[PDB]
Amino acid sequence: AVPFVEDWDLVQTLGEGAYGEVQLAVNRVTEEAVAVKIVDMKNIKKEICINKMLNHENVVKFYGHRREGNIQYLFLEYCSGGELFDRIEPDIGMPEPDAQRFFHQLMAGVVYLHGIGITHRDIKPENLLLDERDNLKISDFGLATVFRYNNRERLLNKMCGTLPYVAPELLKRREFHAEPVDVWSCGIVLTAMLAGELPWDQPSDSCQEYSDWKEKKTYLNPWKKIDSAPLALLHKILVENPSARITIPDIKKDRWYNKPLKKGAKRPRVTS
Ligand SMILES: NCCNC(=O)c1cncc(-c2cnc(Nc3cc(N4CCOCC4)ccn3)s2)c1
Numbered sequence: 262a263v264p265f266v267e268d269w270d271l272v273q274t275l276g277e278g279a280y281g282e283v284q285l286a287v288n289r290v291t292e293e294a295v296a297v298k299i300v301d302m303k304n305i306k307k308e309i310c311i312n313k314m315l316n317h318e319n320v321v322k323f324y325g326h327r328r329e330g331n332i333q334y335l336f337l338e339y340c341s342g343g344e345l346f347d348r349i350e351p352d353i354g355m356p357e358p359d360a361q362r363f364f365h366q367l368m369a370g371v372v373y374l375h376g377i378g379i380t381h382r383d384i385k386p387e388n389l390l391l392d393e394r395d396n397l398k399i400s401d402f403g404l405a406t407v408f409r410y411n412n413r414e415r416l417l418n419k420m421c422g423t424l425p426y427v428a429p430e431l432l433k434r435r436e437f438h439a440e441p442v443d444v445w446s447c448g449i450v451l452t453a454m455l456a457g458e459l460p461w462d463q464p465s466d467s468c469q470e471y472s473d474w475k476e477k478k479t480y481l482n483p484w485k486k487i488d489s490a491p492l493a494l495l496h497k498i499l500v501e502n503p504s505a506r507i508t509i510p511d512i513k514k515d516r517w518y519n520k521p522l523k524k525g526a527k528r529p530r531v532t533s
Pocket residue numbers: 275276283296298321337338339340341342343344387388390400401402
């Protein structure tokens with residue numbers, strides 16, 4: 262009923278790539294911010310379909326979409342804190358309490374997705390967004406797929422993801438379970454947060470850094486920068502055999518996962 266409420270000004274480029282572009286949109290009337298993903302169809306149907314299923318505090322909300330010929334406009338939750346990628350200091354990482362809080366939020370989002378039978382397939386710091394309160398939100402379902410339907414699991418076979426984050430089974434096996442692949446990429450994200458370095462270009466025996474890890478050479482980088490408690494968790498996540506790999510219910514029982522480290526948000530206080 263209120264005129265101009267449907268008008269959005271595209272004010273800043275959030276991202277640009279092969280997929281198209283992401284723009285920060287500001288409502289003409291309310292000044293509400295949304296991210297608008299603009300896809301040049303000249304995959305998107307699957308992304309919209311998957312987005313319509315999502316409703317979780319650690320998953321970028323989907324508001325709807327509009328088609329204007331060969332161009333689709335996806336109205337998505339705007340995350341003002343940007344990418345988790347930019348919170349990782351190169352060769353350092355970030356404070357262990359911050360990494361633990363982000364890891365708890367990432368596990369919350371992943372448990373949710375797996376619970377509704379969705380696998381993200383490209384978990385990495387570039388796709389993990391932060392809102393105004395530094396809450397982590399999983400974004401970009403362009404590579405996502407349904408791995409469970411009608412309570413029946415579908416084994417995956419497509420090569421999807423980003424090499425440094427990809428699980429070794431995706432490189433060595435024709436078929437693989439979806440869930441351990443997302444668990445592995447979360448372990449690589451945790452490594453990046455705690456060491457500000459990726460451990461290997463890819464999880465192959467031909468890759469020295471990977472062979473060194475399997476040989477337990479933790480006196481080497483990035484492992485030497487990581488405390489024994491999170492390192493013990495990484496030893497359980499970064500397991501080559503996906504059947505032996507720790508599951509999320511067990512990650513929630515891990516000693517480091519449950520270790521008190523982080524104080525709550527900076528609340529206003531006065532003395533006397
Ligand atoms: N993953 C690549 C394609 N993107 C998506 O699919 C995709 C899918 N769903 C949602 C989104 C976004 C939502 N909020 C965002 N905020 C944001 C803030 C930035 N900041 C840096 C510049 O100043 C402003 C804050 C920088 C970059 N992004 S991106 C993107």
